[PDB]
Enzyme design. Structure first.
Site, mmCIF file in Angstrom:
data_model
loop_
_atom_site.group_PDB
_atom_site.id
_atom_site.type_symbol
_atom_site.label_atom_id
_atom_site.label_comp_id
_atom_site.label_asym_id
_atom_site.label_seq_id
_atom_site.Cartn_x
_atom_site.Cartn_y
_atom_site.Cartn_z
ATOM 1 C CE1 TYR A 57 -3.299 -2.838 0.333
ATOM 2 C CE2 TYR A 57 -3.912 -1.962 2.488
ATOM 3 C CZ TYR A 57 -4.122 -2.856 1.457
ATOM 4 O OH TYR A 57 -5.155 -3.764 1.571
ATOM 5 C CB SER A 154 -2.674 -12.921 3.346
ATOM 6 O OG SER A 154 -3.775 -12.374 2.649
ATOM 7 C CD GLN A 174 -6.568 -9.569 5.149
ATOM 8 O OE1 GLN A 174 -6.288 -9.119 4.039
ATOM 9 N NE2 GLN A 174 -6.273 -8.930 6.280
ATOM 10 C CE1 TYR A 202 -8.182 -10.259 -1.901
ATOM 11 C CE2 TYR A 202 -7.439 -11.615 -0.054
ATOM 12 C CZ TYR A 202 -7.392 -11.286 -1.402
ATOM 13 O OH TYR A 202 -6.555 -11.974 -2.246
ATOM 14 N N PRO A 204 -15.185 -8.459 -0.645
ATOM 15 C CG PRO A 204 -15.942 -7.232 1.205
ATOM 16 C CD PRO A 204 -14.702 -7.493 0.363
ATOM 17 C CB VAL A 206 -17.484 -8.606 -6.482
ATOM 18 C CG1 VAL A 206 -16.944 -9.040 -7.850
ATOM 19 C CG2 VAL A 206 -17.625 -9.802 -5.545
ATOM 20 C CB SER A 207 -15.171 -4.287 -8.459
ATOM 21 O OG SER A 207 -13.964 -5.030 -8.375
HETATM 22 N N1 LIG Z 1 -4.238 -9.953 -0.599
HETATM 23 C C1 LIG Z 1 -4.834 -9.334 0.380
HETATM 24 O O1 LIG Z 1 -4.691 -9.655 1.543
HETATM 25 C C2 LIG Z 1 -5.772 -8.164 0.099
HETATM 26 C C3 LIG Z 1 -6.445 -7.474 1.211
HETATM 27 C C4 LIG Z 1 -7.312 -6.396 0.896
HETATM 28 C C5 LIG Z 1 -7.532 -5.997 -0.454
HETATM 29 N N2 LIG Z 1 -6.844 -6.714 -1.498
HETATM 30 C C6 LIG Z 1 -7.126 -6.270 -2.904
HETATM 31 O O2 LIG Z 1 -7.523 -4.853 -2.835
HETATM 32 C C7 LIG Z 1 -8.663 -4.614 -3.698
HETATM 33 C C8 LIG Z 1 -9.769 -4.006 -2.888
HETATM 34 O O3 LIG Z 1 -10.177 -5.033 -1.933
HETATM 35 P P1 LIG Z 1 -11.408 -4.708 -1.329
HETATM 36 O O4 LIG Z 1 -11.694 -5.739 -0.194
HETATM 37 O O5 LIG Z 1 -11.390 -3.273 -0.762
HETATM 38 O O6 LIG Z 1 -12.510 -4.964 -2.582
HETATM 39 P P2 LIG Z 1 -13.821 -4.589 -2.933
HETATM 40 O O7 LIG Z 1 -14.822 -5.487 -2.213
HETATM 41 O O8 LIG Z 1 -13.891 -4.743 -4.456
HETATM 42 O O9 LIG Z 1 -14.031 -2.960 -2.563
HETATM 43 C C9 LIG Z 1 -15.410 -2.644 -2.376
HETATM 44 C C10 LIG Z 1 -15.882 -2.159 -3.800
HETATM 45 O O10 LIG Z 1 -17.325 -1.880 -3.606
HETATM 46 C C11 LIG Z 1 -17.662 -0.512 -3.696
HETATM 47 N N3 LIG Z 1 -18.355 -0.090 -2.494
HETATM 48 C C12 LIG Z 1 -17.979 -0.118 -1.167
HETATM 49 N N4 LIG Z 1 -18.912 0.289 -0.331
HETATM 50 C C13 LIG Z 1 -19.966 0.606 -1.176
HETATM 51 C C14 LIG Z 1 -21.246 1.102 -0.870
HETATM 52 N N5 LIG Z 1 -21.741 1.378 0.355
HETATM 53 N N6 LIG Z 1 -22.114 1.335 -1.954
HETATM 54 C C15 LIG Z 1 -21.708 1.084 -3.276
HETATM 55 N N7 LIG Z 1 -20.448 0.595 -3.599
HETATM 56 C C16 LIG Z 1 -19.616 0.376 -2.516
HETATM 57 C C17 LIG Z 1 -16.325 0.266 -3.874
HETATM 58 O O11 LIG Z 1 -16.501 1.332 -4.826
HETATM 59 P P3 LIG Z 1 -15.788 2.812 -4.718
HETATM 60 O O12 LIG Z 1 -14.288 2.571 -4.455
HETATM 61 O O13 LIG Z 1 -16.057 3.371 -6.073
HETATM 62 O O14 LIG Z 1 -16.451 3.529 -3.553
HETATM 63 C C18 LIG Z 1 -15.320 -0.800 -4.302
HETATM 64 O O15 LIG Z 1 -15.260 -0.937 -5.729
HETATM 65 C C19 LIG Z 1 -9.024 -5.977 -4.348
HETATM 66 O O16 LIG Z 1 -8.702 -6.019 -5.742
HETATM 67 C C20 LIG Z 1 -8.260 -7.010 -3.541
HETATM 68 O O17 LIG Z 1 -7.787 -8.093 -4.322
HETATM 69 C C21 LIG Z 1 -5.971 -7.790 -1.222
#
Ligand SMILES: NC(=O)c1ccc[n+]([C@@H]2O[C@H](COP(=O)([O-])OP(=O)(O)OC[C@H]3O[C@@H](n4cnc5c(N)ncnc54)[C@H](OP(=O)(O)O)[C@@H]3O)[C@@H](O)[C@H]2O)c1
Ligand code: NA
Length: 311
Positions: A57, A154, A174, A202, A204, A206-207
């Site tokens: 990060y 992880s 994780q 993580y 959860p 799906v974008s």
């Molecule tokens: N390897 C690991 O340990 C690890 C850990 C954490 C994350 N990651 C990576 O980091 C990336 C992000 O992970 P993530 O867990 O944050 O994924 P995520 O589930 O895809 O992030 C949530 C997604 O949903 C949308 N969202 C969130 N809250 C919302 C709401 N109330 N209403 C409408 N849309 C909402 C966000 O859009 P906006 O951004 O447009 O608001 C975002 O696109 C992933 O590609 C993942 O592979 C890896």
């Protein structure tokens, strides 16, 4: 209120904060660091216990900004969880789990966070050559020295997890988990639940696909990695959009939004104690926390389970 994370002595509010957007410049363009700091600050203010960051990060910047905000509060009131594995090479990375690299990673993390210890330290990704129990033993050294208070892995396979937990030193796992990808339930949950390893998912939402961010008419620009994710291709996209909307009534029932219901569902899994939803701004954090106020009925949970059945 407070959930114990598996075998560790970590007590955390069921909603943690993902900090990939706090100084994660390599991941996001035009990030305002003060906004990131203000989000972290807000989180701690609003009762969030766990801050989830990583070296990748912002190549350490995420840990740095979090470290600055940390000076404002009492260290013992916050659970810092970070990770390492990415080893810089040629404008790209290779995963390294060797003892020397992991210990160095910890010491460098502590300096960037400007703190005496880290609550939870992960092996972000498995490397292809280091016996995983030896990698964990290396982190275990820092644990004994009091530099980290718990260890996690992880993105490990069941096999690699078993090896890493050979001596039962893995407290947290994780992994990728959501309504469209429930494999963990069959492949990991049995084991984690058995060995009292906490499971933190993580991806959860799906974008945004599982958060009602789009409609069946939504389209993305050429080159956008999203209309190439799979769950976004062909009829899969429309199908999932039309399928997620079937959760609208339940959301209405509990006076929240679909994303809150979706996340509450994950939290309801005996094997999961905390979620780490992301955020760019403070206000978004305040909206994530509402998930903790949700209490789905056994009836709601079953419907969702069947509605999003794998096959
Ligand atoms: N390897 C690991 O340990 C690890 C850990 C954490 C994350 N990651 C990576 O980091 C990336 C992000 O992970 P993530 O867990 O944050 O994924 P995520 O589930 O895809 O992030 C949530 C997604 O949903 C949308 N969202 C969130 N809250 C919302 C709401 N109330 N209403 C409408 N849309 C909402 C966000 O859009 P906006 O951004 O447009 O608001 C975002 O696109 C992933 O590609 C993942 O592979 C890896
Ligand atoms: Na649970």
């Amino acid at each position: 209120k407070k959930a114990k994370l598996g075998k560790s002595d970590l007590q955390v509010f069921p909603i943690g904060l993902g900090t990939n957007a706090v100084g994660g410049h390599n991941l996001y363009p035009n990030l305002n660091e003060e906004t990131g700091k203000e989000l972290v600050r807000e989180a701690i203010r609003n009762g969030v216990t766990m801050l989830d960051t990583a070296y990748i990060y912002g190549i350490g910047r995420s840990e740095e900004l979090i470290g600055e905000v940390l000076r404002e509060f009492n260290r013992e009131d916050v659970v810092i969880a970070t990770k390492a594995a990415h080893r810089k090479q040629g404008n790209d990375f290779v995963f390294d789990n060797s003892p020397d690299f992991l210990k160095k990673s910890v010491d460098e993390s502590l300096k960037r966070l400007n703190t005496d210890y880290i609550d939870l330290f992960y092996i972000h990704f498995p490397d292809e050559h280091t016996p995983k129990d030896e990698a964990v033993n290396a982190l275990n050294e820092m644990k004994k020295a009091g530099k980290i208070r718990s260890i996690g892995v992880s993105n490990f396979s069941l096999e690699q997890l078993k090896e890493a937990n050979k001596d039962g030193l893995v407290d947290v796992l994780q992994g990728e988990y959501n309504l469209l990808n429930r494999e963990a339930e069959k492949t990991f949950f049995p084991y984690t639940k058995e060995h009292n390893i906490s499971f933190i998912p993580y991806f959860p939402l799906v974008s945004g696909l599982l958060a009602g961010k789009y409609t069946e008419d939504t389209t993305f620009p050429e080159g956008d990695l999203r209309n190439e994710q799979e769950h976004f291709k062909g009829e899969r996209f429309k199908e999932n959009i039309r399928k997620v909307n079937k959760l609208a009534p339940i959301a209405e029932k509990h006076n929240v939004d679909i994303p809150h219901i979706v996340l509450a569902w994950y939290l309801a899994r005996p094997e999961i104690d905390i979620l780490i939803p992301g955020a760019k701004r403070a206000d978004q954090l305040i909206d994530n926390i509402k998930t903790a106020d949700v209490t789905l009925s056994q009836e709601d949970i079953s419907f969702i389970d069947k509605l999003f059945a794998p096959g």
